[PDB]
Enzyme design. Structure first.
Site, PDB file in Angstrom:
ATOM      1  CB  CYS A 129      61.254  67.600 -14.504  1.00 30.32           C
ATOM      2  SG  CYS A 129      59.742  66.666 -14.468  1.00 30.32           S
ATOM      3  CG  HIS A 144      62.808  63.761 -16.551  1.00 30.37           C
ATOM      4  ND1 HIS A 144      62.685  64.649 -15.708  1.00 30.37           N
ATOM      5  CD2 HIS A 144      63.961  63.754 -17.538  1.00 30.37           C
ATOM      6  CE1 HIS A 144      63.856  65.341 -15.961  1.00 30.37           C
ATOM      7  NE2 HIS A 144      64.854  64.836 -16.851  1.00 30.37           N
ATOM      8  CD  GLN A 174      68.322  66.004 -17.330  1.00 34.15           C
ATOM      9  OE1 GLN A 174      67.555  65.516 -17.168  1.00 34.15           O
ATOM     10  NE2 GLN A 174      69.832  65.718 -17.407  1.00 34.15           N
TER      11      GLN A 174
END
EC number: 3.5.1.44
Lengths: 182, 183
Positions: free
Chosen positions: B3, B59, B79
């Site tokens: 990520c 994240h 993302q």
């Protein structure tokens, strides 16, 4: 994109990693004389990427020097061209799916740098290196820009094969999504 | 890619130009309080990209804030996710070709930051924002890593739409020739 833009982006693929981002305008440059000294001392067990700012030809491009033997040392040439200088318009995709795949001799492109730095080149030499078909008739001598000194500027960096591999994986992973983006 | 690698690459796409190369490790960072102040006075006549390092969700991701009025201002979320944490595995390609092209409200993602920073998990809220299907059953609330302070770190930059356009053209070109770059 212009030839300089393509060149800069290729440098980033070879060199960018956690904590270092290549930025053309900020990096150290070498003259031809300084380059010749570095190339003469290059080990067989290292790979290098050379960014060429070719002010005579009107054009930036990349010379990739993989690990190899110093006798008949191979290299690969990467470029695009908007076609405003000596050489004709050339899409990166077209160069890279045809002539870029065949190795050249590093000595041959270095001989070009030496000749062009003295305005002592010829069209056959230029076409053999830079034209997709090796066609001298596609060059425009009238678009050359020779200046007594400093025709060339160079940037020379060691690279790791793992790093270019990883960066190519990253850009491939973005390509489809990016196109969709606006 | 992870990520964070995806996020950093997206920042480069928006921001890199002659004389500027984005480098995650060296950029200035904002706290949530700082970001909340910046958003309160954000120019309507400029576009911005926000890199989010979300410690609690575990994240990282991008919020794209185009030019627009500060009443119900739109944004886009970009993302990828390897699926080790709260949210499930998500390829950038899949996100971008499905849910990402619908705009969201900047206020909704901001409300999320506020809730998560106070440890008020709302799984429906998280699924609506981050799951490709909006499916709360795919989340794992167990993997939230709330810390008492400093859950979030942000980077905020102005961008020019001409630059993102130019950089996307470059990436597509580079991909088209990539086989010739390795030996």
């Amino acid at each position: 994109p212009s030839c300089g833009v393509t060149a800069n982006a290729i440098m980033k693929l070879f060199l960018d990693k956690d904590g270092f981002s290549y930025c053309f305008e900020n990096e150290q440059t070498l003259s031809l004389e300084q380059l010749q000294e570095r190339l003469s001392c290059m080990p067989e067990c290292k790979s290098f990427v050379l960014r060429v700012n070719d002010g005579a030809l009107g054009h930036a491009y990349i010379v990739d020097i993989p690990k190899g033997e110093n006798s008949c040392r191979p290299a690969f040439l990467y470029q695009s061209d908007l076609g405003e200088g000596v050489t004709r318009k050339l899409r990166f995709e077209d160069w890279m799916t045809h002539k870029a795949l065949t190795p050249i001799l590093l000595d041959d492109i270095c001989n070009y740098f030496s000749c062009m730095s003295q305005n002592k080149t010829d069209l056959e030499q230029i076409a053999t290196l830079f034209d997709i078909d090796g066609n001298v008739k596609m060059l425009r001598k009238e678009n050359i820009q020779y200046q007594k000194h400093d025709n060339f500027s160079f940037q020379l960096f060691e690279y790791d094969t793992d790093n270019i591999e990883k960066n190519i994986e990253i850009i491939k992973s973005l390509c489809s999504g990016a196109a969709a983006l606006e």
